[PDB]
Structure formats: structure tokens, C-alpha cells
């Protein structure tokens, strides 16, 4: 409320902050003065915690701090980060700038955290920073879950959470020693300036430590006597200040005990702090050998050249903190004793500046160097109790996915309650607030996590991320159970969603791409295995019931919206499922046990869709085509080899015999199962005669939109299964196919291109070209030349046309 403070805020925000913002490039090299830049960061954050800031001033601090941190290095930001992570869970509108700062900070230091090597000059985090970042992630995620729905707050936090998740290594094993023993000033919620020291009068001196304070008081006495005579003090028995005479040049042994106290009592206090946190120091044997030793000179050794260890430096840093905190306590009692005014240096030790810190540094170094010269082996009071590193649960990804399955099962229950309330009158629930959080955060957080660490989930020690970071097999079936649960959550739940079901769809597509369920199939939890089978069977039976009821109801709306859901999300979702199955070549083991039969029946259904015609089929023609192509890519059996499919050793009829299937009311023959689907031979003869006829697309669009694409998927997958690739194992394998097959088929494709050059046209050429790209990769360049170069000439001879094509 003071007026100058307003004037000084105006001055800073108008002159200094804009100037330092324009100075952003200059702040790069700062390892020299990291301490003062850290103090600058801390004080800028303190000002950003200014209540009396105008909106313009607040924006000025926001821009300045973000710009400075943008280039400056996280090996300095950690100090401000521990306060940022501590004050963000309040989640007030005041902390939005800190939230943005963390958001873009993790993004700009992405590779430092995610990559174990990071930037070579930068290195890697000390993993205590990783611990605090993990605590930050959990704190924001939870407090956001309990937090009431604020639109802007979730718009801001979601990028922050995604950035933190991407930065944190998924395979980060939680440190066996969780971090305690923090200073009370950090735990100090208000301002973080309460400098309470620890209680240390209880502990007592050992005999080795009293021998240590012996001759150390002698060292300090002699050096301070040198200082006295430098100041001018002379060996005059009278203590005269102006005369600079003092009888105190006598040795510490000759000193009286009264002068020893207060001279040595703070040494006792420093040692009591030494033992207060519990560090134990072990003296070597020269320490008492010199005691037995008793040309010698009572003059002080200089400890300038020697240096201490880096971990000991870290411990000595918080010792500089504790001594400054006692100092700040005494000046606090001074401030409420005076009852008026403020202290220029009431700021915490980290907020302090290096030059005045130098006294604490020299104190810590002199005491530690003295003890290590005397032989006391100083280290932490106790080593880590036990290592649970075999517990893969403490992996950050594993624990996070545990909690993520927790929230996903919760959301499944909330959808069950919402289904019960859809039968009820009310679509309004308090739980709708929590589902807003789920859909708007967890779903995109899943999205970003799998986009960033998809190779980690593919990492199962099969050398994705050759540096390491494998997703454990159990982590992987719980990933697949998450996939199944999201399927259930999206199971005909469009209206329960805010029409945001498209977001869940995209989540399933990318999660499907990240699926590595083959290793789960080989080794995994059988209940989750059955859950996956039930998933792909429920989705199947839904698609067939919809595709029949769309024909028995072709002549004409709950079933209608069910059909819409199926053909808009489920069919795309399973199409992407089948896509990643094909591209990984992983999932052939998924389709073994009744999955094969369900897939033959799905093939019959998709064939019926492709052959059938309706306006909505024309709407979904590209979707149907890519669905058929995806199925053919995923499917393990040459389905047009029906004459010899009994030779397919991998087919379940060969594998688990057929005895029980034959007993049950099933055709149990591939030819019996798929009579509507044509055979290989008549299929090529029909499509070849159609091509040489050269009709437009519009007469028989279905062929070119579904089967020729699905025939393309067929050639692409079964090229290596054909003796065209391996003439060996002939009649030792089911699939017999020749390169001339798809050679004639591509010649046919070119002829259709020629006869459709004149008229008709559409995006269907471009999409079939996309599907034909792998086939034109398989084709021979000698075939390319000759068989396509005239077709390139035909692609250019329609100069009048404007349609785009290869």
C-alpha cells in the first residue's frame, strides 16, 4: 500500500523489465554468475507474487520472466523450480504464469529430460530434479482432478501436464530414498522465509570431536592474532582500542577458559549442527598418531589451494543455508523487537547474493577442510536402507499407468452411472464435472504420452530406444487393458460425450498404433487376454448387427445412431487396429483362437458392405475401402487359396485341429465360410475383363474403391508368402502366387487410369495411388520403364484437364 512501492513497480516494469526482456539473448553464458542469476529469478518470482500489481505490470513480469527463462539454463532454474512446483498446487489465477513457465520450460528442455544423455553440454538432470518434477506432475494432475471445471485453467494446464509427461523418462525408477530432510524455509507456505533451524542441544560431543575442537581453537586464535597485529594490535597487557595493544598473543592453552567460551562456543554450535542432521565423521589413524606426536611451529596452515568434494559441497551449501537461517532468525527477533521497519536482507539464503554468501562459504570450507585434514571421513549419516530397483512398479510410467488405469476404471464407473441416468431424466450430474476433467485432460495426456514415448511402449528389450527404457510386459498388457477400457468408454457413448467422441477415436487410433500386443499374447495375464478377445468380438458383433440391420432397415432412430457410431468410429477404429497389426506384422498371433473364425465372419460382412450399394455406402466408400485393405493386411491366411488352405500350418484348423469346431454348427471349411467372396482366379478374370472393358468409375465404383485396394493389400502382404519371393518351400507352404499376378494387375490399373483419363475422375484415383504406392515399390524398375513411362505420357497428355495425379 505504500506509494513508493507503486512508483518503484512502475519504474521496474517500464524500464528494467522491458530492457531485460530485450536483453534475452545476452543471458546465455551465466555459469560464472549462476548464483546471482538464480537470485534474480527468485526475486522476479517474488515480484510476480505481488498483489498490488496492475494488469499491465503483471503482464510485463510474465513476458520478462518467460523470455529470460526461455534461453537461460535449467541447471540454474532448479532453484526456482522447487518453489514453482511448491506454489502451483494452490492453482489460483495468480499461478497461471508459473504454470505457463513450467509448460514451455519442459518443452524447451525436452531432450535434456527425456533423453538420458540430453544435450552434451547440458548433460542430464541430477534425477533429484526428476524426483521434484515427478512430484510436480502428480501434484498438478491430482489437484486438477479434484479442481472444479474452469475452462481456461484446463486449457492452460493440459499443455503443462503433457510437457511434464513427455520430459519425464517413462522408465524412471522411483528413487529408493524418497526425499526428506528439506529445510523448513522450503516447507514454509507463506513467502518461504521462516528460517527455523533444527534442535541440536540434545546431541553431545565424542572424544574424537573434543580433540577436534582442540588445536582448532588454537588455529583460529593464531590466525585471528595475525589479523589483530595486522589491524595494529600490540602485545600490551592493557586492552586499549586506540593504542591497539592487547595481551592476547599468548597461545590458546595459555588463554583462560572464559575467553575460550564464546570464542569456542560457536564452534560447539557449528559442530552440533554438523551432527544435528546426523552426518557421521570417521577419523583416520594419523588423527591420533599426531596426538601421540604431541622442529614444530604453532602457526596456521592455509587451506586455499585444497578443494573439497562435490557432494560435500552440496551438503555444505545447505549448511551455509542453516547458518544463514539462524542469522535470519536472530535478525527476525530483532525486527519484532524494534517493532518497526523492514530488513534489507531478510531474504532466504537462495535469494541472497554470492558476495555476502562468501562468509558462509568460507566458514563451511574451513571447517570441512580442517576435519578432513584431521582425518574425519565426512559423509551422510546413513546410506540407503535397501534397493527395490527390481520393483518395476516404481518406474514412473508404471506407477503413472497404475493411477491411469485407476482413473480409467473410475471413468468407466461414471459412464455406468451416466448410462443409468440416461434411463433417468437427468443428463446433469456433479460427476459430469469429473468426466470433463477426464475427457479434456486424461485423454489428451494419454495422447501426448503415447505420441512421445510410443517407442518406449514398443520398447520391450527388443531394442526400441536401444539406450534402454523398455516397457515391461506387464506394463504392456495393462496398456492393452487400457485400450479395451477406452473402447468400452466409447462403446456407443457419443451423446454422453460432448460430441467429443472424435477425441476418444483419435486416442484409440494412436493407442492402436502403439499397441504391441504380440508380446502380451506370448506372455501376459490371461484375464486381460480374454478381455482383448472380448473387445475384438464385441466390436465385431456390433459391426455385423449394424450392417445387417442397415439392410433389413435399408428401406425407411436409436439403431440408426448406433449404425452411425459404428461406421463413423468403430469401423475406423478397428481399421486402424488392423493397420498397425499389418505394419508391425504383429497380431497374427492375436488372431489364433476363435479370432480367426470371427475374422472370417467380419470378412464376409465387409465383403457384403463392399459389394452392396447405398448412398451412405458411397459416403463411407473410402472408409470401407481402407477397412477392407486393413483387414486383408491384418489377416493371416491366403483367403483366396481355398483349394489349398488346409495346407496352411498356421491356420487354427491345422493348429488346434478342427474336431470341436466340426462338432459345433460351423462350416469349418474356408470355402464353406466364404462362398460369396470370389476366388483368386475368377476374381482376377472378372477385374481384368472389367479393366479391358474400360468402363468409368461410376458404373462399378465398388470394385475400384474396396476390392482393388484390398487386392493391393493382399498382394503386398502375400508377396513374400508367394514363391514369387521364395520358390523354396513350394508345397511346403499354403500360399502360391507369382509376380506376374500383380504385374498384370498393375497393367490393368494403368489401363483403368487411361480409360478414366477422359471423364468421371475423383479423389478415388489419388487414394488408390496411395494404396498402390507399396505395390509400385515391389514392382521392378525394368517394369517401371516401358510399362509406366507411356502411362506417364498419358498422365501429361491431358493438358486441358486440371485434376492432379502422379
Amino acid at each position: 500500500a505504500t506509494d513508493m512501492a507503486l512508483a518503484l513497480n512502475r519504474y521496474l516494469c517500464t524500464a528494467v523489465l522491458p530492457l531485460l526482456t530485450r536483453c534475452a539473448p545476452l543471458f546465455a553464458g551465466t555459469e560464472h554468475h549462476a548464483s546471482l542469476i538464480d537470485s534474480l529469478l527468485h526475486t522476479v518470482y517474488r515480484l510476480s507474487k505481488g498483489c498490488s500489481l496492475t494488469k499491465a505490470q503483471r503482464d510485463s513480469i510474465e513476458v520478462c520472466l518467460l523470455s529470460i527463462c526461455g534461453q537461460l539454463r535449467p541447471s540454474m532454474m532448479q532453484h526456482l523450480l522447487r518453489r514453482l512446483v511448491f506454489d502451483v498446487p494452490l492453482l489460483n489465477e495468480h499461478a497461471k504464469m508459473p504454470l505457463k513457465l513450467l509448460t514451455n520450460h519442459y518443452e524447451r528442455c525436452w531432450k535434456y529430460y527425456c533423453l538420458p544423455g540430453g544435450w552434451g553440454n547440458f548433460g542430464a538432470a541430477s534425477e533429484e530434479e526428476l524426483h521434484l518434477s515427478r512430484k510436480l506432475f502428480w501434484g498438478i494432475f491430482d489437484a486438477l482432478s479434484q479442481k472444479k471445471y474452469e475452462q481456461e485453467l484446463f486449457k492452460l494446464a493440459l499443455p503443462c501436464l503433457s510437457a511434464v509427461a513427455g520430459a519425464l523418462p517413462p522408465d524412471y525408477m522411483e528413487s529408493n530414498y524418497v526425499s526428506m530432510m528439506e529445510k523448513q524455509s522450503s516447507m514454509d507456505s507463506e513467502g518461504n522465509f521462516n528460517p527455523q533451524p533444527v534442535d541440536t542441544s540434545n546431541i553431545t560431543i565424542p572424544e574424537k570431536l573434543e580433540y577436534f575442537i582442540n588445536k582448532y581453537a588454537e588455529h583460529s586464535h593464531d590466525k585471528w592474532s595475525m589479523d589483530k597485529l595486522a589491524n595494529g594490535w600490540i602485545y600490551g597487557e592493557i586492552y586499549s582500542d586506540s593504542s591497539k595493544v592487547q595481551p592476547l598473543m599468548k597461545p590458546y592453552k595459555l588463554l583462560s577458559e572464559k575467553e575460550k567460551e564464546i570464542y569456542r562456543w560457536p564452534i560447539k554450535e557449528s559442530l552440533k549442527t554438523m551432527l544435528a542432521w546426523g552426518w557421521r565423521i570417521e577419523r583416520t589413524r594419523e588423527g591420533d598418531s599426531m596426538a601421540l606426536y604431541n622442529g614444530y611451529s604453532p602457526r596456521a596452515i592455509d587451506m586455499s589451494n585444497v578443494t573439497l568434494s562435490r557432494d560435500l559441497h552440496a551438503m555444505a551449501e545447505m549448511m551455509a543455508e542453516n547458518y544463514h537461517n539462524i542469522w535470519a532468525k536472530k535478525k527476525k527477533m530483532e525486527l519484532e523487537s524494534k517493532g518497526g521497519g523492514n530488513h534489507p536482507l531478510l531474504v532466504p539464503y537462495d535469494t541472497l547474493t554470492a558476495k555476502e554468501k562468501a562468509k558462509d562459504r568460507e566458514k563451511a570450507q574451513d571447517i570441512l577442510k580442517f576435519l578432513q585434514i584431521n582425518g574425519y571421513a565426512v559423509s551422510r549419516g546413513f546410506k540407503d536402507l535397501e534397493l527395490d530397483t527390481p520393483s518395476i512398479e516404481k518406474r514412473f510410467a508404471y506407477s503413472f499407468l497404475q493411477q491411469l488405469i485407476r482413473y480409467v476404471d473410475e471413468a468407466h464407473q461414471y459412464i455406468l452411472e451416466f448410462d443409468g441416468g440416461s434411463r433417468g431424466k437427468g443428463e446433469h450430474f456433479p460427476y459430469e464435472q469429473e468426466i470433463k476433467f477426464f475427457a479434456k485432460v486424461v485423454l489428451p495426456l494419454i495422447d501426448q504420452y503415447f505420441k512421445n514415448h510410443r517407442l518406449y511402449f514398443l520398447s520391450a528389450a527388443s531394442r526400441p530406444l536401444c539406450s534402454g527404457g523398455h516397457a515391461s510386459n506387464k506394463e504392456k498388457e495393462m496398456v492393452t487393458s487400457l485400450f479395451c477400457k477406452l473402447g468400452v468408454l466409447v462403446r456407443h457413448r457419443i451423446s454422453l460425450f460432448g460430441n467429443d467422441a472424435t477425441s476418444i477415436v483419435n486416442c484409440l487410433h494412436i493407442l492402436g498404433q502403439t499397441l504391441d500386443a504380440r508380446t502380451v499374447m506370448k506372455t501376459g495375464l490371461e484375464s486381460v487376454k480374454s478381455a482383448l478377445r472380448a473387445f475384438l468380438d464385441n466390436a465385431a458383433e456390433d459391426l455385423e448387427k449394424t450392417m445387417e440391420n442397415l439392410k433389413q432397415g435399408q428401406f425407411t432412430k436409436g439403431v440408426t445412431q448406433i449404425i452411425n457410431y459404428t461406421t463413423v468410429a468403430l469401423l475406423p477404429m478397428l481399421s486402424s487396429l488392423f493397420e498397425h497389426i499389418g505394419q508391425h506384422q504383429f497380431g497374427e498371433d492375436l488372431i489364433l483362437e476363435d479370432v480367426q473364425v470371427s475374422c472370417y465372419r467380419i470378412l464376409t460382412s465387409l465383403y457384403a458392405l463392399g459389394t452392396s450399394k447405398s448412398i451412405y455406402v458411397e459416403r463411407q466408400r473410402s472408409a470401407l475401402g481402407e477397412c477392407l485393405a486393413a483387414f486383408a493386411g491384418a489377416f493371416p491366411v491366403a483367403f483366396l487359396e481355398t483349394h489349398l488352405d488346409k495346407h496352411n500350418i498356421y491356420s487354427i484348423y491345422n493348429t488346434k485341429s478342427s474336431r470341436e469346431r466340426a462338432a459345433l454348427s460351423l462350416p469349418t471349411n474356408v470355402e464353406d465360410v466364404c462362398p460369396n467372396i470370389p476366388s483368386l482366379e475368377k476374381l482376377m478374370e472378372e477385374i481384368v475383363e472389367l479393366a479391358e472393358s474400360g468402363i468409368r468409375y461410376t458404373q462399378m465404383p465398388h470394385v475400384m474403391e474396396v476390392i482393388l485396394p484390398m487386392l493391393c493389400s493382399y498382394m503386398s502382404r502375400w508377396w513374400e508368402h508367394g514363391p514369387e519371393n521364395n520358390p523354396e518351400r513350394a508345397e511346403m507352404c499354403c500360399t502360391a502366387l507369382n509376380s506376374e499376378h500383380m504385374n498384370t494387375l498393375l497393367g490393368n490399373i494403368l489401363k483403368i487410369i487411361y480409360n478414366n483419363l477422359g471423364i468421371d475422375e475423383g479423389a478415388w484415383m489419388k487414394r488408390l495411388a496411395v494404396f498402390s504406392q507399396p505395390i509400385i515399390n515391389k514392382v521392378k524398375p525394368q517394369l517401371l520403364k516401358t510399362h509406366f513411362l507411356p502411362l506417364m505420357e498419358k498422365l501429361k497428355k491431358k493438358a486441358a484437364t486440371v485434376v492432379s495425379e502422379e
Partner: protein
């Protein structure tokens, strides 16, 4: 062959305790132990074999049905390590006995060819004990105790072992063959796949630094499919064994290209140029980096027909082989293996040597200080320092201060002041010979190379034993005998050499140390200090003079042979043992013919063609180079 009771009870004890040690091994492997139910054991399974397979023991001929014990893959994967440990115990007991491996089995010499690692052991014997162990472990679970397999650990060492500290060797053409203009092509045949890098390097490339890590080199790390210049990008495809990479440069437009088995390598983006813009500078020369156990071949296109991918790619574009019209083969230069002593550079990242002139009251001094201490990249490794000139021992060993004694004497003195704050046990002081070319991160006085020639009389008496070593030094840790360290007098080890007698005596803070060295006549002795950086200031040489001893300059130099005043002429300078030096492969090696004549005649080695090289001998360093 009988029941447990009649079977001798000490053999019973050995069988029992080996079963105990076997299950202890299962525990040490982390195999969880559990039984489905005690009833499954209270009802043991039985089947019987014919009379020939019957025995005195009433126990069933094969109680455990071989049918329903199908061992599980993790358990078979465990049995082989169990056999590993069993053979380790066997061989360790055999060594306790005192046996040793002999390719023929012996008892009087008591040798066993089977006393070898299991991976190299006889297949028949290993499978015999292995099937015994398989059967035992399988019955161990079939006995009701469904033992839970431990984790199938995937972690592998990935073969990080390398001979000595050296990790890779850099092969490059001579600097004079650098190209400043034109367009050039050479091939690099990768015999083995691995951490190989190949490309074009500036003449300033250092052998020790990784190829392309700095700005000097431009390489293609095909092992990880990465470019390498001032950092790594992603480019090209990884090679297979036998793949050939053509390194391809056109200095006119400052471009670089790489190909693999003829096909061009492609950037992350669609561009085909590996490196888009660089500087001509002082030219480029071919270079390759070869990792551990990596074999590669350069083909500089001496005979253009030898290049095999040049025709399909490189010739039509207009590129020229590197040895397009050279009459004689290009001389390759590679990274030197043995470290050598070279003068400390002024721009050295870590060592700073400042020369202190000698005043009237202060001896001339050279101090070694480390610049980067307390900062990141500070070197805690031991570094080896030596003076540039050696003291000469006498040709034949004879068998205030008195000016006459100083003029007739041949003892020389230098001393080293470990700076207060530099830890004494990490600093060694004394003399080394010219042959000290061994580098170690941790150097111990016990490791020094020594040999003792024992010339004997006719009947074999040891009438003369001569110790020979390259390192004659002592540590300050045991020289700090009185204890503690004086600021007024920092730890001051002095070295006294008697060139007339070859006796090396060390004095510490005015006290003569017990350690003394006797050297051979005509021995080159370099003053040397080995130190580990524990402070910004480590040590300094003192060229002073103690009573009745000549100064070091009187021994090192010839003109000052009779000048008792200490001197530090500019020729004397501190050198340090370093790896940054190249070496030259001779253009021609000796004809050596090796063959086994027969079983009787052994192996023949014959060389009949002479080769000679002019040797340049640096007199002060006792070193010779081609």
C-alpha cells in the same frame, strides 16, 4: 551302486551337501521357491523299469514319470547356468588341489584338458552332466515344488572391453595430399559392422578426439546412421558387413555426399547432400574411424578398376578417384598407440606451466597449475610430467660449501614443492628413463616395469644381479613421515643423483628417505613428477642447490658444467605424457614367409630381402624417428 545306508557315508555326505549347494545356487540365481500343495508330495508318483534296470535299492526304478515332467523354457535357460556354477565349483576344488590344464590328461604331471571353461568344454561330458542336472532340476519341480523361475535378465555388457584405454584408431592420408579444389571420390569397404566412421577430415584433426565430434572432421557414423560434424544428425542407412561406403566431395560448390553399396544416402529431409556448406580452409584428406574389433579397408582408387561402385555412381557424375594419377602409393597416417612426452602447449585446456625466474634468494622454478579446477570437465586423472633434458650417468662406475668439493663432485640435485593444499599421496617424485611410455589412470609404484638380469659364474652362482627399470620415483604420502603438512615449508622432496656411482637418494624436508635406487652406467635419467590434480596449484620444480651437490643445470647442460649457480635456460621446459600424436605406416614392409614344413620340421620363418630406413635421432630426448 547301493542304498543310501550301505553307500559309503562320506560319499553320502558329499551327495547331500552338493544337493544343498545346488539349491543354494538356485537361491543365488533368484529362483522363487514354492510348492502347489504338500498333498502332491504326500502322494508320490511311481513307475517301474525292467529287471535289468532294477537295483538293490528298494526305491522305484524310475518313480518320477518322465511323461508329465515337461520342463519350462525359463527352467532350461536356468539349467545351463546351474551347470556353469557346478563346473566352477568343480574346477575351483581342482585348483585348491593344485591341478592345471594340460591338453593331454596327466597324473604324474597331474594335468587335465577338461579343466577348461564350460563354454569351451567337451560337448559329450558337458551334455552328460547337463542332462543329469536337467533330470534333477526337473524332478525338483515334479516333486511338488513348482519352483518359480527368476527374472530372465536381458541386460548385456554389449562388449565395451577395449585393450588399454584407447577406444578407436583414426586412419588418414598424409597432410600434403589435401585437396583444396576439384571433385574427388574414394571407397571404404567395411569388413565388419560396428562403430566405424568415415569421411573427410581437415589437417588439424586430432587422433584422440572422436571423428567428427569437433569441427575438424566430417564423417558418417553408419552404425547409428548419423552424420558427425560439431555434433550428430540423422542421415543415411546403417550398413551391413561387406557394405562399401563411397566418400564423395566436390570442393567447387562446397558439398559432400555419401553412398552405400552404390545407392546414394539421403538426409532426414529429401536433400541428397550430406553437408551443404563448408569452408575450403587448408583442404581435406580422407579419414576413417575404427572402433573396437573393427576391420575396414580404404580404396583410394590407385587402380580405378579396383573401385567397384565408382562406375555405377561417381564416374558418370564426373568425380575423380583420390589417387587419380599418382605414381606412388599414398602414405597413410594413423593414431599413435604408445603415449609420448611433448611440451605442454600454451593453449592446453587443463595444464598451465609458468616459469619463475630465479632471484638472488630464490631458486629458478617451474610450477604446474591446473586452470579448469573447480569447474566442469576438471581432470582428476593422473598426469605425468617430466623435464626436457636427461642427466647422464657415468660411462663406467668408479670402483658454507667446499668449493673444491663442488668442483670435483658429480652429484646433481633438484627438488619438488608440493603446494600446500595439494594432497601428497597423489604426487610421486623422482626420475624416469626414456622408455617410460605406459599410461594409466591409476599408477602405483608396485606396477613399474622391472627386470633383474642375473649374470652368473660358470657353476651358476649369482655373482652379479642388476635391477633395471624405467621408473625410479617415490611418493610423497610415505615421505610425509613426521606427519602433518607445514605451510612455512610445504612438502619438499629433493632428489640427489650421483652420476659417478648411479646412486639415487631422496631427501624429504631435510630427512634422507630410506628408499634408494641403483642404476646402470650410462643411464638416461629425466626428472619427473606424477601428480593428480587436487588443487589449482599442484607442485613446482626447484633447481636449487643443497650443500656439496651440484645444481641440475650443471648436469643437464655442458657449458655450465662448472657453474655452481643454479640456472634454468629456456631449453629446459616441462613436458607431459600425451596421446595426441600421429604415426606413419611404412610404404613397404619386410618379406616374411611362414609355413609348416612338416610335423617334424616345425614352422619356418625366412626373410631374404633387405629394407632400410633413415633414422633421425633427437639427441636430447634419447628418441629416434624415421
Amino acid at each position: 551302486l547301493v542304498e543310501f545306508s550301505k553307500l559309503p557315508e562320506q560319499e553320502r555326505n558329499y551327495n547331500l551337501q552338493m544337493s544343498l549347494e545346488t539349491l543354494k545356487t538356485l537361491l543365488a540365481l533368484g529362483c522363487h521357491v514354492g510348492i502347489s500343495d504338500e498333498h502332491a508330495e504326500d502322494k508320490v508318483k511311481k513307475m517301474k523299469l525292467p529287471k535289468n534296470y532294477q537295483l538293490t535299492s528298494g526305491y522305484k526304478p524310475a518313480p518320477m514319470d518322465l511323461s508329465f515332467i515337461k520342463l519350462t523354457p525359463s527352467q532350461e535357460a536356468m539349467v545351463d547356468k546351474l551347470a556353469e556354477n557346478a563346473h566352477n565349483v568343480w574346477a575351483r576344488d581342482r585348483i585348491r588341489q593344485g591341478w592345471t590344464y594340460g591338453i593331454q590328461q596327466d597324473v604324474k604331471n597331474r594335468r587335465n584338458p577338461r579343466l577348461v571353461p564350460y563354454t569351451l568344454l567337451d560337448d559329450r561330458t558337458k551334455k552328460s552332466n547337463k542332462d543329469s542336472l536337467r533330470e534333477a532340476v526337473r524332478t525338483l519341480l515334479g516333486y511338488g515344488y513348482n519352483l518359480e523361475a527368476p527374472d530372465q535378465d536381458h541386460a548385456a555388457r554389449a562388449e565395451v572391453c577395449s585393450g588399454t584405454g584407447e577406444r578407436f584408431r583414426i586412419f588418414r592420408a598424409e597432410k600434403t595430399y589435401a585437396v583444396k579444389a576439384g571433385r574427388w571420390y574414394f571407397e571404404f569397404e567395411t569388413v565388419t559392422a560396428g562403430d566405424m566412421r568415415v569421411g573427410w577430415s581437415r589437417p588439424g584433426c586430432q587422433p584422440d578426439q572422436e571423428l567428427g565430434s569437433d569441427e575438424r572432421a566430417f564423417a558418417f557414423d553408419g552404425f547409428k546412421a548419423q552424420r558427425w560434424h560439431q555434433g550428430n544428425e540423422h542421415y543415411g542407412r546403417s550398413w551391413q558387413a561387406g557394405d562399401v561406403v563411397g566418400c564423395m566431395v566436390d570442393m567447387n560448390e562446397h558439398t559432400m555426399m555419401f553412398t552405400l553399396n552404390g545407392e546414394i544416402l539421403l538426409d532426414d529431409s529429401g536433400s541428397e547432400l550430406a553437408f551443404k556448406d563448408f569452408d575450403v580452409g587448408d583442404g581435406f584428406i580422407p579419414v576413417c574411424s575404427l572402433g573396437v574389433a573393427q576391420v575396414g579397408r580404404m580404396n583410394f582408387g590407385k587402380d580405378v578398376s579396383t573401385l567397384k561402385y565408382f562406375t555405377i555412381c561417381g564416374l558418370q557424375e564426373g568425380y575423380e578417384p583420390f589417387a587419380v594419377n599418382t605414381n606412388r602409393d599414398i602414405t597413410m597416417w594413423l593414431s599413435k598407440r604408445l603415449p609420448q612426452f611433448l611440451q605442454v602447449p600454451s593453449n592446453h585446456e587443463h595444464i598451465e606451466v609458468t616459469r619463475i625466474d630465479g632471484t638472488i634468494d630464490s631458486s629458478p622454478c617451474l610450477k604446474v597449475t591446473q586452470k579448469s579446477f573447480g569447474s566442469q570437465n576438471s581432470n582428476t586423472d593422473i598426469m605425468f610430467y617430466r623435464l626436457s633434458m636427461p642427466i647422464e650417468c657415468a660411462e663406467v662406475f668408479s670402483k658454507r660449501d667446499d668449493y673444491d668439493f663442488l668442483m670435483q663432485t658429480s652429484t646433481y640435485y633438484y627438488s619438488v614443492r608440493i603446494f600446500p593444499g595439494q594432497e601428497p599421496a597423489n604426487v610421486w617424485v623422482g626420475w624416469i628413463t626414456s622408455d617410460f611410455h605406459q599410461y594409466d589412470t591409476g599408477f602405483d609404484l608396485d606396477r613399474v616395469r622391472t627386470v633383474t638380469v642375473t649374470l652368473g659364474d660358470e657353476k651358476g652362482k649369482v655373482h652379479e644381479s642388476i635391477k633395471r627399470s624405467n621408473c625410479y620415483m617415490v611418493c610423497a604420502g610415505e615421505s610425509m613421515s613426521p606427519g602433518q603438512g607445514r605451510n612455512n615449508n610445504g612438502l619438499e622432496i629433493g632428489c640427489v643423483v650421483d652420476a659417478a656411482s648411479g646412486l639415487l637418494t631422496f631427501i624429504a624436508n631435510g630427512k634422507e628417505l630410506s628408499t634408494y635406487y641403483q642404476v646402470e652406467p650410462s643411464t638416461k635419467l629425466f626428472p619427473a613428477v606424477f601428480a593428480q590434480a587436487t588443487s589449482p596449484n599442484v607442485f613446482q620444480f626447484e633447481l636449487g642447490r643443497i650443500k656439496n651437490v651440484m645444481p641440475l643445470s650443471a648436469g643437464l647442460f655442458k657449458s655450465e658444467h662448472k657453474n655452481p649457480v643454479p640456472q634454468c635456460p629456456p631449453r629446459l621446459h616441462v613436458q607431459f605424457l600425451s596421446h595426441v600424436l600421429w604415426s606413419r605406416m611404412p610404404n613397404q614392409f619386410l618379406k616374411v614367409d611362414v609355413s609348416r614344413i612338416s610335423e617334424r620340421q616345425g614352422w619356418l620363418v625366412q626373410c631374404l630381402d633387405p629394407l632400410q630406413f633413415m633414422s633421425l635421432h633427437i639427441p636430447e630426448e634419447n628418441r629416434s624417428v624415421d
